[PDB]
Amino acid sequence: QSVLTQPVSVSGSPGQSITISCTGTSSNADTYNLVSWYQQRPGKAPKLMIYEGTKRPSGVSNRFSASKSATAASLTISGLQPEDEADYYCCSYATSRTLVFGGGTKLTVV
Amino acid sequence: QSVLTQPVSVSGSPGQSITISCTGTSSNADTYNLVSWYQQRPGKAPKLMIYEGTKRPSGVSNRFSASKSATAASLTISGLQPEDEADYYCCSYATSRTLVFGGGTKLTVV
Amino acid sequence: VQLVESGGGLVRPGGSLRLSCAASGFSYSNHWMHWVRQAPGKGLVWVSRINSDGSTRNYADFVKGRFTISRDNAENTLYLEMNSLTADDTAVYYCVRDGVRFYYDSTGYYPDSFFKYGMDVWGQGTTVTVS
Amino acid sequence: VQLVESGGGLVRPGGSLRLSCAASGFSYSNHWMHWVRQAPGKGLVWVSRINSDGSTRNYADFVKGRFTISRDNAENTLYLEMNSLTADDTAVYYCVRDGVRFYYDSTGYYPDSFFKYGMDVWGQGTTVTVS
Amino acid sequence: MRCIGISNRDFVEGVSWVDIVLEHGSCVTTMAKNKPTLDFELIKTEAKQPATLRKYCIEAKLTNTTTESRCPTQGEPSLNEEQDKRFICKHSMVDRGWGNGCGLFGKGGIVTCAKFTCKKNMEGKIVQPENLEYTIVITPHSGEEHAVGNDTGKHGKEIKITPQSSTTEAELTGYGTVTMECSPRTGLDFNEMVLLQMEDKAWLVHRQWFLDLPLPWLPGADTGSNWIQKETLVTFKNPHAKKQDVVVLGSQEGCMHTALTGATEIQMLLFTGHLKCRLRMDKLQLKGMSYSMCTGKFKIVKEIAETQHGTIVIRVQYEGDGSPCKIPFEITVLGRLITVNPIVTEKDSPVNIEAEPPFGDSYIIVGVEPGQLKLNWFK
Amino acid sequence: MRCIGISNRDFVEGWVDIVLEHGSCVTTMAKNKPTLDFELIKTEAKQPATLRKYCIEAKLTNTTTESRCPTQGEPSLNEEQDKRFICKHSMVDRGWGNGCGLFGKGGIVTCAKFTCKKNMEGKIVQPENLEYTIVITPHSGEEHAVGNDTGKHGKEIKITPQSSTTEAELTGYGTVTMECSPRTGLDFNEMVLLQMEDKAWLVHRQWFLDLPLPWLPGADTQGSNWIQKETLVTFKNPHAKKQDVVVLGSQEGCMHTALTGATEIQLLFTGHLKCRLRMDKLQLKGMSYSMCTGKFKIVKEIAETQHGTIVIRVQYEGDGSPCKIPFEIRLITVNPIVTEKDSPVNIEAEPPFGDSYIIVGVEPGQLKLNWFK
Ligand SMILES: *[C@@H]1O[C@H](CO[C@@H]2O[C@@H](C)[C@@H](O)[C@@H](O)[C@@H]2O)[C@@H](O[C@@H]2O[C@H](CO)[C@@H](O[C@@H]3O[C@H](CO[C@H]4O[C@H](CO)[C@@H](O)[C@H](O)[C@@H]4O)[C@@H](O)[C@H](O[C@H]4O[C@H](CO)[C@@H](O)[C@H](O)[C@@H]4O)[C@@H]3O)[C@H](O)[C@H]2NC(C)=O)[C@H](O)[C@H]1NC(C)=O
Ligand SMILES: *[C@@H]1O[C@H](CO[C@@H]2O[C@@H](C)[C@@H](O)[C@@H](O)[C@@H]2O)[C@@H](O[C@@H]2O[C@H](CO)[C@@H](O[C@@H]3O[C@H](CO[C@H]4O[C@H](CO)[C@@H](O)[C@H](O)[C@@H]4O)[C@@H](O)[C@H](O[C@H]4O[C@H](CO)[C@@H](O)[C@H](O)[C@@H]4O)[C@@H]3O)[C@H](O)[C@H]2NC(C)=O)[C@H](O)[C@H]1NC(C)=O
């Protein structure tokens, strides 16, 4: 077992910076080393934003960055834009052979 | 195949005699030799009245008799009583290993 | 002598049901047993028969292979396993004994063509509603 | 690069369904493939994954053994056979590729514990309604 | 009356005890001077207290396949399944390196586990000869309208014997008691023999042969999911150090049947052996014997029919006012009577009389004048 | 570059003769010629003529019986004319107590539907119809090419015992002539490729035809009229009371045991392909490029292969590219070149026994790495 928890919602204003945390219970340093982040815009399919805790795939905006510790993983969005309004999900291993997503964070751009 | 046909309905008055025919299409002398008759009173389970074309089981009223030929089988009810008001069905072999009932005759005692 | 049916009730279209019948007061294992049905306000329709051994199981044309008749002699039980049920199958299902065949073949085994028979014992019937 | 799901629709409770996914524009046979679902108005829920060979098939806890993942490499197809479906299973089902594992294990065979992964290609999803 | 119609039938007659041989699908008719004629049949043979020696898996299925590998020098992999006794596991080595997720190039350890599930089995049972129960049915020649050719048992007294309880006294309602002294004569000795049961088929086989079968088994004690020797039906394949495969070895059902050709087969428990009994009839009495002779006339209910052993069966109904009374019978005297002391119980109930007519033309005379029946036979 | 990481690897140095087989990789080198990696990826039997198909597991369904009273003749069922049904006539004891006016032996007939659950088909395969798939991967020192088993870097080539010789073009290295000779384990003539589900074997024709099992001819594929149904079906009537029809049980494991002393097949075949390689039309990519001037960076820690050789992944920084990488310790990845500064290079070299110095680049910023073999 590993259970991933995220804040239910976060509000931000355009131009500001927001950080979404992903904290685990029966988790360890490897849980956070393997965290991946997904953006799901209203009515759209999810998109990979970060993998391996901090790596950003090509094509993904440089406004998205991520950090990791032995106790949590975090996604940071700098220079908030209205298009960033979406649900964000963290993902990692529940066991050695299964994955699990966090509950998701609804980001509102005010 | 063997298909058994009976009149849809018959009306009779108390004390009178009525005869219900059972005629077959792709049938033969054995079809009629093996005809059995069933009485189904309103809201009751069927009751065997005749078997082997003309044999009456013990307990069945002597007012019920039956006849057979190489072309038809018939059930005769003598001294009609209100309790005779029922649906009557003939039955025989459809094939060497399956049985079939006639469509039934609704007997009304006027 | 009695026959008591069970297992009837409401079933959804395409659904399955298993009817049962408890026999008593006669040598069950030596008798042929039949299933007969009757749609509401309609006539009697022969469904199936089984010999003593279960080596002979016959079915009416409308039972393409959707129905399976079976028996448990020591338990004095008759069954009708029904699958892919439609509104065409809504009816009262009667458990029936062939008492006259017993007087010619007391083993109830031989499936002789066009043998002398008589459905002398009937249950009250169990209602199957495909709705 | 695309993933297109099929087989979604209305299913009765206790019913079965087979989802399919057509993959194109990449070396399908060398990639791990996953199924992810999302109940209406709810979050993403990981369902299953399969390696190149089909020798490793993993399932989420809620799939006791009701779902079987499979693939046909030459046909570029992924499947999800689902039985004993309940209202708990109503969701959009997404076909997903693990593109990052390909850069570490190009065979897509080895089921190493806690492997570096990334679900980089997603289909539009197919709706399953257990109603 | 059961024997009438059975082809494998014996007519045993006692001098002025009487020894008989009963077995499956065989009926026996016994006769003695001033004693009722009786019909014996072995209805069932049963092995009652069977001690399961060993149970073997003949068809298996592998499920829940799981694998774990390690990078070179990172040690040996492990699964929890290796401690689950329903799982079959194997360790091997695979080629590891950069292109398959390892920083180093070398032989990385692998481990494959799969759930061994038995689909079909055969159990071997140790049966004590003395635990072999036999069921004999004794039917008297009562000339009853329904008793002729009846295989139900609503007319016959059922009796149970065992090689130990070999001797039993059995009471017949209206004829007295009959002493049965049976001796066991089975085909093969049950000692060092195992009753190998496979579904509906069964055989009697040598103990050592049975134990030496190369199949997964469960001991007689564990009647379990921890099949011993799972390896006999499971194979692990890793020929190129690329991948390890777990493969089921396929159903041994037909293989077993072929191996069991030169073995004592058992039908299904219908056993090969016969029961050699001794019969004491001193406590038996002819029903009636005190009744007076019938005065009235007789009617022929069913046309005279010949049995497979040349004997004939006559179905007759009484009309006179004498019943219960002795039926007068003669085959002029030439032929003999099988249904000895034929009697009427009720005028309504007809009587079945079995008699042996003489070779050629004969006259079957039933009743006393007026209204005497003078029937004709040709054997 | 495929061979790097494969344990069963050969270093053939030069025409040049090589031996390819399954789970074996081959590295070829020649003076002023590119280093190439060969692997036999697939063996396939292409035009297979089904000889006979056998039933190994069957099921009996639709059991039906008809009897007659003594002297009333022989019974008959329509099923006796249905070729998917197995029937048998016998005699039973008839009489008054079982529905006959006479006592005697009444004829009986039992029919049941023979349905095959599992089969194995025997195929005739022409040796010349055996297609081989070889993958040629050049030592291009590409960042992704190292240990790659996909084929996005290698030219696939097909050969057959007939079309044994093929010229194959490599983008940037020219063409390579390969002249392959077939060397299978068993002669396919008088041999039958017996396929049972996922298992397969090569067996003698007469043995195959002489198997006592129900079968469908090579002509009838998809038929239901199994010949010799009797081999898996048994009729039992020991006491003239009843006739029983019994299935003889799965011959799957029985077959596997019978096939012990037979050539098993995993289509991964036993044989090897002895080829000859002409490299006169092959050319070293670059060879005209100038030497790299800038400094090099060590992208991944130096790793040793199972054959003592070492792999170095390095990235360029200078403004010379495309250029020849200066290297010194023999070299496996001969003529190492930079294509783009961004794309790192994988160099495979054989270090000497004991302490050595791996020197990559020219001063200033020269790399002087240390090895211990
Ligand atoms: C094998 O033996 C079976 C048992 O025989 C018994 O032996 C001893 C122990 C005595 O008890 C003896 O009396 C038994 O016969 C035997 O089964 C028996 O067979 C008869 C059929 O002959 C069964 O039914 C009975 O017969 C009448 C038939 O009526 C017609 O014929 C008479 C003339 O005989 C006419 O007067 C009538 O008008 C009819 O045309 C049945 O109607 C009746 O059965 C039902 O009776 C009431 C009716 O309300 C019901 O409540 C019952 O449930 C019955 O369904 C008679 O009972 C008889 O039931 C049956 N006995 C037993 C114990 O089962 C069998 O036939 C023999 N095998 C062969 C091959 O002969
Ligand atoms: C086995 O070989 C595979 C094929 O290699 C190719 O070889 C020849 C034919 C050339 O075409 C060569 O260029 C190819 O590499 C090989 O697969 C390839 O691996 C790369 C991963 O390195 C795949 O993805 C590509 O890389 C970027 C990574 O971005 C990060 O790194 C860069 C620096 O390198 C940073 O600048 C970034 O900020 C990132 O931090 C991917 O992001 C990208 O993939 C996606 O690109 C767009 C994004 O919108 C999507 O639309 C695509 O669908 C991709 O998902 C790059 O494409 C590369 O796709 C893949 N090539 C092929 C042809 O599949 C494999 O890794 C080798 N096996 C091993 C064990 O190494």
Side-chain angles (χ1 to χ4, degrees), chain E residues 7 95 107 149 237 249-255 257 267, chain F residues 7 93 97 105 236 248-254 256 266:
Chain E
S7 57
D95 289 336
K107 298 281 196 178
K237 297 173 175 186
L249 177 63
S251 295
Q252 301 294 128
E253 187 175 29
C255 336
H257 299 158
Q267 284 271 251
Chain F
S7 57
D93 289 336
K105 298 282 196 177
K236 297 174 176 186
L248 177 63
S250 64
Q251 301 294 128
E252 187 176 30
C254 337
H256 299 157
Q266 284 270 252

PDB file of all heavy atoms in Angstrom, chain E residues 7 95 107 149 237 249-255 257 267, chain F residues 7 93 97 105 236 248-254 256 266:
ATOM      1  N   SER E   7     -32.443 -62.973 -19.492  1.00  0.00           N
ATOM      2  CA  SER E   7     -31.757 -63.990 -20.289  1.00  0.00           C
ATOM      3  C   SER E   7     -30.764 -64.800 -19.459  1.00  0.00           C
ATOM      4  O   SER E   7     -30.765 -66.027 -19.549  1.00  0.00           O
ATOM      5  CB  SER E   7     -31.074 -63.366 -21.503  1.00  0.00           C
ATOM      6  OG  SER E   7     -30.158 -62.348 -21.134  1.00  0.00           O
ATOM      7  N   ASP E  95      19.873 -11.933 -19.250  1.00  0.00           N
ATOM      8  CA  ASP E  95      20.836 -10.934 -19.683  1.00  0.00           C
ATOM      9  C   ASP E  95      20.258  -9.567 -19.372  1.00  0.00           C
ATOM     10  O   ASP E  95      19.151  -9.234 -19.807  1.00  0.00           O
ATOM     11  CB  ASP E  95      21.142 -11.054 -21.186  1.00  0.00           C
ATOM     12  CG  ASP E  95      21.960 -12.269 -21.576  1.00  0.00           C
ATOM     13  OD1 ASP E  95      22.689 -12.800 -20.709  1.00  0.00           O
ATOM     14  OD2 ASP E  95      21.894 -12.674 -22.758  1.00  0.00           O
ATOM     15  N   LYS E 107      24.448 -10.919 -15.882  1.00  0.00           N
ATOM     16  CA  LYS E 107      23.360 -11.859 -15.650  1.00  0.00           C
ATOM     17  C   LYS E 107      22.574 -11.441 -14.422  1.00  0.00           C
ATOM     18  O   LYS E 107      23.061 -11.563 -13.296  1.00  0.00           O
ATOM     19  CB  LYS E 107      23.880 -13.303 -15.504  1.00  0.00           C
ATOM     20  CG  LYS E 107      24.589 -13.857 -16.734  1.00  0.00           C
ATOM     21  CD  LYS E 107      23.622 -14.315 -17.811  1.00  0.00           C
ATOM     22  CE  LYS E 107      24.330 -15.202 -18.801  1.00  0.00           C
ATOM     23  NZ  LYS E 107      23.400 -15.714 -19.837  1.00  0.00           N
ATOM     24  N   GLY E 149     -42.000 -59.630 -14.220  1.00  0.00           N
ATOM     25  CA  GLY E 149     -41.004 -58.758 -14.834  1.00  0.00           C
ATOM     26  C   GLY E 149     -40.726 -57.444 -14.128  1.00  0.00           C
ATOM     27  O   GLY E 149     -40.039 -56.588 -14.693  1.00  0.00           O
ATOM     28  N   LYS E 237      10.862 -22.744 -18.902  1.00  0.00           N
ATOM     29  CA  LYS E 237      11.705 -22.620 -20.094  1.00  0.00           C
ATOM     30  C   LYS E 237      12.410 -21.268 -20.213  1.00  0.00           C
ATOM     31  O   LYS E 237      11.752 -20.231 -20.305  1.00  0.00           O
ATOM     32  CB  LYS E 237      10.895 -22.913 -21.377  1.00  0.00           C
ATOM     33  CG  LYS E 237      10.328 -24.330 -21.488  1.00  0.00           C
ATOM     34  CD  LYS E 237       9.410 -24.465 -22.703  1.00  0.00           C
ATOM     35  CE  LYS E 237       8.907 -25.872 -22.928  1.00  0.00           C
ATOM     36  NZ  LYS E 237       8.143 -26.002 -24.200  1.00  0.00           N
ATOM     37  N   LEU E 249       1.619 -29.064 -18.375  1.00  0.00           N
ATOM     38  CA  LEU E 249       1.955 -30.232 -19.184  1.00  0.00           C
ATOM     39  C   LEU E 249       0.773 -30.991 -19.820  1.00  0.00           C
ATOM     40  O   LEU E 249       0.999 -32.028 -20.437  1.00  0.00           O
ATOM     41  CB  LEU E 249       2.826 -31.199 -18.379  1.00  0.00           C
ATOM     42  CG  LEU E 249       3.198 -32.504 -19.077  1.00  0.00           C
ATOM     43  CD1 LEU E 249       4.036 -32.240 -20.316  1.00  0.00           C
ATOM     44  CD2 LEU E 249       3.962 -33.431 -18.142  1.00  0.00           C
ATOM     45  N   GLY E 250      -0.448 -30.481 -19.700  1.00  0.00           N
ATOM     46  CA  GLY E 250      -1.613 -31.093 -20.331  1.00  0.00           C
ATOM     47  C   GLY E 250      -2.171 -32.352 -19.701  1.00  0.00           C
ATOM     48  O   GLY E 250      -1.432 -33.181 -19.161  1.00  0.00           O
ATOM     49  N   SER E 251      -3.503 -32.506 -19.833  1.00  0.00           N
ATOM     50  CA  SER E 251      -4.313 -33.593 -19.279  1.00  0.00           C
ATOM     51  C   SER E 251      -3.759 -34.985 -19.511  1.00  0.00           C
ATOM     52  O   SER E 251      -3.396 -35.354 -20.626  1.00  0.00           O
ATOM     53  CB  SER E 251      -5.730 -33.520 -19.851  1.00  0.00           C
ATOM     54  OG  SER E 251      -6.389 -32.337 -19.433  1.00  0.00           O
ATOM     55  N   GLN E 252      -3.689 -35.739 -18.422  1.00  0.00           N
ATOM     56  CA  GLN E 252      -3.191 -37.102 -18.361  1.00  0.00           C
ATOM     57  C   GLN E 252      -4.342 -38.105 -18.252  1.00  0.00           C
ATOM     58  O   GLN E 252      -4.100 -39.284 -17.985  1.00  0.00           O
ATOM     59  CB  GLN E 252      -2.230 -37.266 -17.176  1.00  0.00           C
ATOM     60  CG  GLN E 252      -1.015 -36.346 -17.210  1.00  0.00           C
ATOM     61  CD  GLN E 252      -0.064 -36.626 -18.340  1.00  0.00           C
ATOM     62  OE1 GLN E 252       0.295 -35.719 -19.080  1.00  0.00           O
ATOM     63  NE2 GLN E 252       0.423 -37.859 -18.456  1.00  0.00           N
ATOM     64  N   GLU E 253      -5.584 -37.637 -18.491  1.00  0.00           N
ATOM     65  CA  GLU E 253      -6.813 -38.426 -18.406  1.00  0.00           C
ATOM     66  C   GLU E 253      -6.792 -39.661 -19.309  1.00  0.00           C
ATOM     67  O   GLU E 253      -6.837 -40.787 -18.807  1.00  0.00           O
ATOM     68  CB  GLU E 253      -8.037 -37.538 -18.679  1.00  0.00           C
ATOM     69  CG  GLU E 253      -9.370 -38.230 -18.441  1.00  0.00           C
ATOM     70  CD  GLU E 253     -10.585 -37.338 -18.602  1.00  0.00           C
ATOM     71  OE1 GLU E 253     -10.524 -36.372 -19.398  1.00  0.00           O
ATOM     72  OE2 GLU E 253     -11.609 -37.614 -17.938  1.00  0.00           O
ATOM     73  N   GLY E 254      -6.687 -39.434 -20.614  1.00  0.00           N
ATOM     74  CA  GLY E 254      -6.636 -40.504 -21.601  1.00  0.00           C
ATOM     75  C   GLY E 254      -5.380 -41.341 -21.495  1.00  0.00           C
ATOM     76  O   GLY E 254      -5.412 -42.543 -21.769  1.00  0.00           O
ATOM     77  N   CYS E 255      -4.278 -40.707 -21.048  1.00  0.00           N
ATOM     78  CA  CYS E 255      -2.957 -41.313 -20.839  1.00  0.00           C
ATOM     79  C   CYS E 255      -3.106 -42.372 -19.784  1.00  0.00           C
ATOM     80  O   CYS E 255      -2.645 -43.500 -19.975  1.00  0.00           O
ATOM     81  CB  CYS E 255      -1.932 -40.261 -20.422  1.00  0.00           C
ATOM     82  SG  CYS E 255      -2.351 -38.578 -20.924  1.00  0.00           S
ATOM     83  N   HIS E 257      -6.030 -43.826 -18.765  1.00  0.00           N
ATOM     84  CA  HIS E 257      -6.887 -44.891 -19.305  1.00  0.00           C
ATOM     85  C   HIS E 257      -6.065 -45.930 -20.087  1.00  0.00           C
ATOM     86  O   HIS E 257      -6.244 -47.128 -19.879  1.00  0.00           O
ATOM     87  CB  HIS E 257      -8.009 -44.322 -20.201  1.00  0.00           C
ATOM     88  CG  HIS E 257      -8.974 -43.382 -19.532  1.00  0.00           C
ATOM     89  ND1 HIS E 257      -9.708 -42.478 -20.270  1.00  0.00           N
ATOM     90  CD2 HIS E 257      -9.320 -43.254 -18.229  1.00  0.00           C
ATOM     91  CE1 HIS E 257     -10.457 -41.818 -19.405  1.00  0.00           C
ATOM     92  NE2 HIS E 257     -10.261 -42.250 -18.165  1.00  0.00           N
ATOM     93  N   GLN E 267     -17.084 -51.442 -13.526  1.00  0.00           N
ATOM     94  CA  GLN E 267     -18.153 -50.659 -14.139  1.00  0.00           C
ATOM     95  C   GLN E 267     -18.901 -49.820 -13.107  1.00  0.00           C
ATOM     96  O   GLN E 267     -18.961 -50.187 -11.932  1.00  0.00           O
ATOM     97  CB  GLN E 267     -19.093 -51.543 -14.975  1.00  0.00           C
ATOM     98  CG  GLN E 267     -18.515 -51.959 -16.323  1.00  0.00           C
ATOM     99  CD  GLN E 267     -18.844 -50.962 -17.402  1.00  0.00           C
ATOM    100  OE1 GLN E 267     -19.653 -51.226 -18.295  1.00  0.00           O
ATOM    101  NE2 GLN E 267     -18.244 -49.783 -17.332  1.00  0.00           N
TER     102      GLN E 267
ATOM    103  N   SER F   7      24.987 -11.882 -23.839  1.00  0.00           N
ATOM    104  CA  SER F   7      26.012 -12.804 -23.355  1.00  0.00           C
ATOM    105  C   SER F   7      26.536 -13.710 -24.463  1.00  0.00           C
ATOM    106  O   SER F   7      27.750 -13.855 -24.594  1.00  0.00           O
ATOM    107  CB  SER F   7      25.503 -13.626 -22.175  1.00  0.00           C
ATOM    108  OG  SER F   7      24.325 -14.351 -22.493  1.00  0.00           O
ATOM    109  N   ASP F  93     -32.403 -56.994 -23.132  1.00  0.00           N
ATOM    110  CA  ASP F  93     -33.445 -57.907 -22.695  1.00  0.00           C
ATOM    111  C   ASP F  93     -34.746 -57.128 -22.647  1.00  0.00           C
ATOM    112  O   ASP F  93     -34.845 -56.092 -21.980  1.00  0.00           O
ATOM    113  CB  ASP F  93     -33.137 -58.504 -21.312  1.00  0.00           C
ATOM    114  CG  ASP F  93     -32.004 -59.507 -21.293  1.00  0.00           C
ATOM    115  OD1 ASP F  93     -31.723 -60.110 -22.356  1.00  0.00           O
ATOM    116  OD2 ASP F  93     -31.412 -59.713 -20.206  1.00  0.00           O
ATOM    117  N   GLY F  97     -42.268 -56.632 -18.291  1.00  0.00           N
ATOM    118  CA  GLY F  97     -41.883 -55.648 -17.284  1.00  0.00           C
ATOM    119  C   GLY F  97     -41.153 -54.419 -17.792  1.00  0.00           C
ATOM    120  O   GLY F  97     -40.824 -53.535 -16.994  1.00  0.00           O
ATOM    121  N   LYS F 105     -34.558 -60.687 -26.989  1.00  0.00           N
ATOM    122  CA  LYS F 105     -33.531 -59.682 -27.199  1.00  0.00           C
ATOM    123  C   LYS F 105     -34.035 -58.637 -28.174  1.00  0.00           C
ATOM    124  O   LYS F 105     -34.167 -58.911 -29.371  1.00  0.00           O
ATOM    125  CB  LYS F 105     -32.218 -60.318 -27.697  1.00  0.00           C
ATOM    126  CG  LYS F 105     -31.572 -61.304 -26.728  1.00  0.00           C
ATOM    127  CD  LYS F 105     -30.830 -60.619 -25.595  1.00  0.00           C
ATOM    128  CE  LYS F 105     -29.901 -61.594 -24.926  1.00  0.00           C
ATOM    129  NZ  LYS F 105     -29.109 -60.943 -23.854  1.00  0.00           N
ATOM    130  N   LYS F 236     -20.645 -49.330 -23.930  1.00  0.00           N
ATOM    131  CA  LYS F 236     -20.694 -50.366 -22.896  1.00  0.00           C
ATOM    132  C   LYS F 236     -22.095 -50.927 -22.648  1.00  0.00           C
ATOM    133  O   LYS F 236     -23.000 -50.191 -22.254  1.00  0.00           O
ATOM    134  CB  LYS F 236     -20.080 -49.858 -21.572  1.00  0.00           C
ATOM    135  CG  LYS F 236     -18.597 -49.483 -21.633  1.00  0.00           C
ATOM    136  CD  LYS F 236     -18.136 -48.862 -20.317  1.00  0.00           C
ATOM    137  CE  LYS F 236     -16.655 -48.557 -20.275  1.00  0.00           C
ATOM    138  NZ  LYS F 236     -16.213 -48.084 -18.937  1.00  0.00           N
ATOM    139  N   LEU F 248     -13.212 -40.960 -24.102  1.00  0.00           N
ATOM    140  CA  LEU F 248     -11.988 -41.587 -23.613  1.00  0.00           C
ATOM    141  C   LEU F 248     -10.964 -40.655 -22.939  1.00  0.00           C
ATOM    142  O   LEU F 248      -9.892 -41.124 -22.575  1.00  0.00           O
ATOM    143  CB  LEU F 248     -11.320 -42.388 -24.728  1.00  0.00           C
ATOM    144  CG  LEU F 248      -9.988 -43.043 -24.375  1.00  0.00           C
ATOM    145  CD1 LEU F 248     -10.160 -44.080 -23.268  1.00  0.00           C
ATOM    146  CD2 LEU F 248      -9.363 -43.738 -25.583  1.00  0.00           C
ATOM    147  N   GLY F 249     -11.283 -39.381 -22.749  1.00  0.00           N
ATOM    148  CA  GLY F 249     -10.392 -38.462 -22.049  1.00  0.00           C
ATOM    149  C   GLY F 249      -9.191 -37.944 -22.811  1.00  0.00           C
ATOM    150  O   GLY F 249      -8.591 -38.656 -23.630  1.00  0.00           O
ATOM    151  N   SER F 250      -8.820 -36.688 -22.487  1.00  0.00           N
ATOM    152  CA  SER F 250      -7.738 -35.920 -23.105  1.00  0.00           C
ATOM    153  C   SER F 250      -6.434 -36.670 -23.258  1.00  0.00           C
ATOM    154  O   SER F 250      -5.940 -37.292 -22.323  1.00  0.00           O
ATOM    155  CB  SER F 250      -7.499 -34.601 -22.383  1.00  0.00           C
ATOM    156  OG  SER F 250      -7.056 -34.806 -21.052  1.00  0.00           O
ATOM    157  N   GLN F 251      -5.909 -36.618 -24.475  1.00  0.00           N
ATOM    158  CA  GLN F 251      -4.673 -37.255 -24.895  1.00  0.00           C
ATOM    159  C   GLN F 251      -3.540 -36.236 -25.001  1.00  0.00           C
ATOM    160  O   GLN F 251      -2.480 -36.560 -25.541  1.00  0.00           O
ATOM    161  CB  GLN F 251      -4.873 -37.968 -26.239  1.00  0.00           C
ATOM    162  CG  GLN F 251      -5.941 -39.044 -26.229  1.00  0.00           C
ATOM    163  CD  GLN F 251      -5.617 -40.225 -25.361  1.00  0.00           C
ATOM    164  OE1 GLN F 251      -6.421 -40.609 -24.522  1.00  0.00           O
ATOM    165  NE2 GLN F 251      -4.485 -40.879 -25.592  1.00  0.00           N
ATOM    166  N   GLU F 252      -3.756 -35.017 -24.461  1.00  0.00           N
ATOM    167  CA  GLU F 252      -2.811 -33.904 -24.491  1.00  0.00           C
ATOM    168  C   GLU F 252      -1.458 -34.254 -23.872  1.00  0.00           C
ATOM    169  O   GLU F 252      -0.445 -34.249 -24.574  1.00  0.00           O
ATOM    170  CB  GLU F 252      -3.436 -32.659 -23.849  1.00  0.00           C
ATOM    171  CG  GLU F 252      -2.590 -31.404 -23.976  1.00  0.00           C
ATOM    172  CD  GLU F 252      -3.250 -30.152 -23.436  1.00  0.00           C
ATOM    173  OE1 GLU F 252      -4.063 -30.256 -22.488  1.00  0.00           O
ATOM    174  OE2 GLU F 252      -2.936 -29.056 -23.954  1.00  0.00           O
ATOM    175  N   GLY F 253      -1.467 -34.588 -22.585  1.00  0.00           N
ATOM    176  CA  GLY F 253      -0.265 -34.968 -21.855  1.00  0.00           C
ATOM    177  C   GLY F 253       0.330 -36.267 -22.348  1.00  0.00           C
ATOM    178  O   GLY F 253       1.551 -36.436 -22.329  1.00  0.00           O
ATOM    179  N   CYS F 254      -0.541 -37.174 -22.833  1.00  0.00           N
ATOM    180  CA  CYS F 254      -0.196 -38.485 -23.388  1.00  0.00           C
ATOM    181  C   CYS F 254       0.672 -38.260 -24.597  1.00  0.00           C
ATOM    182  O   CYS F 254       1.730 -38.884 -24.720  1.00  0.00           O
ATOM    183  CB  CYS F 254      -1.451 -39.271 -23.756  1.00  0.00           C
ATOM    184  SG  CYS F 254      -2.932 -38.758 -22.859  1.00  0.00           S
ATOM    185  N   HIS F 256       2.365 -35.389 -25.373  1.00  0.00           N
ATOM    186  CA  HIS F 256       3.631 -34.797 -24.919  1.00  0.00           C
ATOM    187  C   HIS F 256       4.646 -35.881 -24.521  1.00  0.00           C
ATOM    188  O   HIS F 256       5.802 -35.815 -24.933  1.00  0.00           O
ATOM    189  CB  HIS F 256       3.418 -33.815 -23.748  1.00  0.00           C
ATOM    190  CG  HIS F 256       2.538 -32.627 -24.032  1.00  0.00           C
ATOM    191  ND1 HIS F 256       1.905 -31.952 -23.008  1.00  0.00           N
ATOM    192  CD2 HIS F 256       2.239 -32.012 -25.201  1.00  0.00           C
ATOM    193  CE1 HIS F 256       1.227 -30.969 -23.576  1.00  0.00           C
ATOM    194  NE2 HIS F 256       1.399 -30.960 -24.895  1.00  0.00           N
ATOM    195  N   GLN F 266      10.577 -24.508 -30.067  1.00  0.00           N
ATOM    196  CA  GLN F 266      10.069 -23.504 -29.135  1.00  0.00           C
ATOM    197  C   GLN F 266       9.211 -22.455 -29.847  1.00  0.00           C
ATOM    198  O   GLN F 266       9.372 -22.229 -31.044  1.00  0.00           O
ATOM    199  CB  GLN F 266      11.208 -22.860 -28.321  1.00  0.00           C
ATOM    200  CG  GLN F 266      11.767 -23.736 -27.208  1.00  0.00           C
ATOM    201  CD  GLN F 266      11.025 -23.507 -25.921  1.00  0.00           C
ATOM    202  OE1 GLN F 266      11.548 -22.905 -24.982  1.00  0.00           O
ATOM    203  NE2 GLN F 266       9.777 -23.944 -25.859  1.00  0.00           N
TER     204      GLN F 266
END
